[PDB]
Amino acid sequence: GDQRFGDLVFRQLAPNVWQHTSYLDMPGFGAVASNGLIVRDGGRVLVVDTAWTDDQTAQILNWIKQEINLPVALAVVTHAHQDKMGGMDALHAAGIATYANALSNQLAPQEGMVAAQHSLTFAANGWVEPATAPNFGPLKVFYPGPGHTSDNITVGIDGTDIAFGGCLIKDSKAKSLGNLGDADTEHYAASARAFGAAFPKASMIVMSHSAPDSRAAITHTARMADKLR
Ligand SMILES: Cc1cc(C)c2c(CP(=O)(O)O)cc(=O)[nH]c2c1
Ligand SMILES: [Zn+2]
Ligand SMILES: [Zn+2]
């Protein structure tokens, strides 16, 4: 099922959806996997999240060329940390239109990231303002509230059973909530639950650091976050 392509791993999740995985050393603590998504929408490809680095992200584009062979119309990135935005320059070099939460773009320079070209803004109920996400096809972008970071956003794939929680959601057996350095611990539980409520049909939950899981990833993440309050 997993396809090794250089130093990256690709896994098909649905007829038009693949998960990309890349790795970065955290010195003294080992190699950390990060996952994003690749979606074919008719004659074009849409990407969710970069890899950790420009070189890895260019390799994602190379895999897309060889295994899908359609233009990448856009990429959306889900917060201003390296695992999700570290390859922005590679997307720009490839001519790909890039989108992030306005707050992610504001935070990008101080986080050592390059901002996306375009900023998403969100209604008070969390749904993206549609004019800021033109041509997103089946991608439905939702801001669930502050959690893993204040800017974290999430993405559902219409026409599939898949929703992507990024670094907000951990798997159903996870022992911790991971890196809380930029987290909002008071609001985390509610934000995890809001993600679940936004995508009630999503039975396959994709996330940044574990294989896809059932919706027990959402309940378990929220229950762990209850303890932070
Ligand atoms: C201090 C720190 C910062 C980050 C961004 C990480 C990440 C990326 P993430 O916070 O987006 O998951 C993974 C990790 O394992 N440790 C970290 C430590
Ligand atoms: Zn993060
Ligand atoms: Zn993460």
Q: Are 141 and 120 in contact (CB under 8 A)?
A: yes
Judge if the beta carbon of residue 24 lies within 6 A of ligand 1: no
Q: What are phi and psi of 188, to 5 degrees?
A: -55, -50
Q: Tell me the technique behind this structure.
A: X-ray
Q: Output the residue whose Cα is nearest ligand 1's atom 8.
A: 83
Q: Are 41 and 14 in contact (CB under 8 A)?
A: no
User: How far is the C-alpha of 126 from the C-alpha of 207, rounded, in Å?
Assistant: 19
- Is 187 labeled as ligand-binding? no
Q: Output the residue whose Cα is nearest ligand 1's atom 10.
A: 179
DSSP string, the chain: -EEEETTEEEEEEETTEEEEEEEEEETTTEEEEEEEEEEEETTEEEEES--SSHHHHHHHHHHHHHHT-S-EEEEEE-SSSHHHHTTHHHHHHTT-EEEEEHHHHHHTGGGTPPPPSEEE-B-TTSBBPGGGSTT-TTEEEE---SSSSTT--EEEETTSSEEE-TTS---TT-SS----TT--TTTHHHHHHHHHHH-TT--EEE-SSS--B-THHHHHHHHHHHTT-
Residue 54 Cα distances to 82, 109, 138, 189, angstroms: 10, 16, 26, 33
Residue 213's identity, in one-letter code, is D
Judge if the beta carbon of residue 178 lies within 6 A of ligand 1: yes
- Is 179 labeled as ligand-binding? yes
Q: What are phi and psi of 138, to 5 degrees?
A: -80, -5
Judge if the beta carbon of residue 182 lies within 6 A of ligand 1: no
Q: Output the residue whose Cα is nearest ligand 1's atom 16.
A: 179
Nearest partner of 148 among 213, 83, 205, judged by Cα: 83
- Is 69 labeled as ligand-binding? no
Give resolution, Å, one decimal.
Answer: 1.1
Q: Give me the domains of the chain, ranges plus CATH numbers.
A: 2-227 (3.60.15.10)
Judge if the beta carbon of residue 219 lies within 6 A of ligand 1: no
Judge if the beta carbon of residue 167 lies within 6 A of ligand 1: yes
User: How far is the C-alpha of 36 from the C-alpha of 22, rounded, in Å?
Assistant: 9
Q: Are 30 and 207 in contact (CB under 8 A)?
A: no
Residue with tokens 């990008």: 108
- Is 16 labeled as ligand-binding? no
